[PDB]
Design an enzyme around this catalytic site. Sequence first.
Site, PDB file in Angstrom:
ATOM      1  N   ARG A  10      -8.056 -10.705  -5.928  1.00 10.23           N
ATOM      2  CA  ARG A  10      -8.505 -12.050  -5.605  1.00 10.23           C
ATOM      3  C   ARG A  10     -10.026 -12.118  -5.589  1.00 10.23           C
ATOM      4  NH1 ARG A  10      -7.973 -14.539  -0.317  1.00 10.23           N
ATOM      5  NH2 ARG A  10      -7.722 -12.322   0.218  1.00 10.23           N
TER       6      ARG A  10
ATOM      7  N   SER B 218      -8.821  -1.885  -0.880  1.00  8.12           N
ATOM      8  CA  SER B 218      -7.699  -1.506  -0.031  1.00  8.12           C
ATOM      9  C   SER B 218      -6.817  -0.408  -0.628  1.00  8.12           C
ATOM     10  CB  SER B 218      -6.875  -2.740   0.352  1.00  8.12           C
ATOM     11  OG  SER B 218      -7.635  -3.606   1.173  1.00  8.12           O
TER      12      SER B 218
ATOM     13  N   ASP C 195     -10.260  -4.213   5.494  1.00  8.56           N
ATOM     14  CA  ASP C 195      -9.618  -5.486   5.837  1.00  8.56           C
ATOM     15  C   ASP C 195      -9.517  -5.785   7.340  1.00  8.56           C
ATOM     16  OD1 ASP C 195      -6.297  -5.393   6.417  1.00  8.56           O
ATOM     17  OD2 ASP C 195      -7.210  -3.557   5.628  1.00  8.56           O
TER      18      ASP C 195
END
Length: 455
Positions: free
Chosen positions: A77, A145, A198
Amino acid sequence: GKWGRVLAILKAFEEDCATPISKLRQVADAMTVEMHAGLASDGGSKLKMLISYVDNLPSGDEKGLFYALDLGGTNFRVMRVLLGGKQERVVKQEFEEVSIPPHLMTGGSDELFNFIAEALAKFVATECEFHLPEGRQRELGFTFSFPVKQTSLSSGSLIKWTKGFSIEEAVGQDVVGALNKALERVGLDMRIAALVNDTVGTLAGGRYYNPDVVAAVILGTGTNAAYVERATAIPKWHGLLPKSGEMVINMEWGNFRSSHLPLTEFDHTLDFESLNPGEQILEKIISGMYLGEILRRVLLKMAEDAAFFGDTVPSKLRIPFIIRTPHMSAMHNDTSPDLKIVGSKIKDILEVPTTSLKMRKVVISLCNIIATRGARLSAAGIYGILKKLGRDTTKSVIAMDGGLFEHYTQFSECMESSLKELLGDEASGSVEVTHSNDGSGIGAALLAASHSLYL
């Protein structure tokens, strides 16, 4: 004896899972002890208590256009946020989700990052409006991640690939430099202001909106927590202090364990049959990935040993992780007098043709027992963090995210109310839990803002 055997299994499970307040306090105390331990030396605790390398959390006064890249799977994203200062805060946000072609998941490093850099450039070109620049270079928060070893604010080495990635040369190399190269090779004047975790991003997003945010907890498929520690109270850290003496710590609290965790045979077997036995013990009893798996294992025993689903064990019930998180939330949330929704989910998942109310009552009871234990232990963990900060006596805000906190309403209610009981009437008033969404997206863009060269 048969359904009496079912009730015996249920009763012992309920008892073995119990978390009276006295035990929760011991779990909390053990968390605080382990937090000190992990800060005392590298490898000091099963809690890694990692320095996050954040120099400055967002304050809310930030102004300008900031970008984020959230790369955690075959779908990534890109996004931007327009910040307008104290009053307005986040004016506008935009994003695009992009899928990584399966060939780039296994090819060279250069090809993967070139692709990502190109999507970013096309995305930047969709800015409306002087949306950007005081002659300013664009700044990006980069959430990576995959297993990574972060070594500074803007560098980190890939440890091992996951999710069907296998770019062997990328292993042990700096992902920020890799992306930088591709950003250079592409014609996009974009600085990477921060490599972002995150959970730290969730904390940053909360703090941006609320100056009293002191911690972030993710309770979704996985679990983690981060909090703001006094930089001078970390014996293992000898590096330069951050601006406000605030050191964000990435706890990696999933690996917490303690004799005070009330475990059952089903937890022990789950752990024994896991890929990482003896590790991630707390995660295995509080996270969404595992709650449904615990339910499956108890039901399987009732099916094998007490003919729960008749004289034949449903073959689907023997499939690890077939019962998942929102299945469980859905059944637990069922208030119908015939437990229609429990029956419907059991029917779909296990492919059984029929269930009785009595069976459905046992199933929803098991959901309640498992969710309640997970939620109460989560509260104990948070209370442990508050104790580490000396905020168990007296605003202290906890920024939260994840499917369990967000959508599994009974879990969230149980966690917050148990935390309230741990705190007590006097001190609980000063504690709040807020939803901080998209730590890997907007959270990262806000960390870019708080580490901007134009601050």
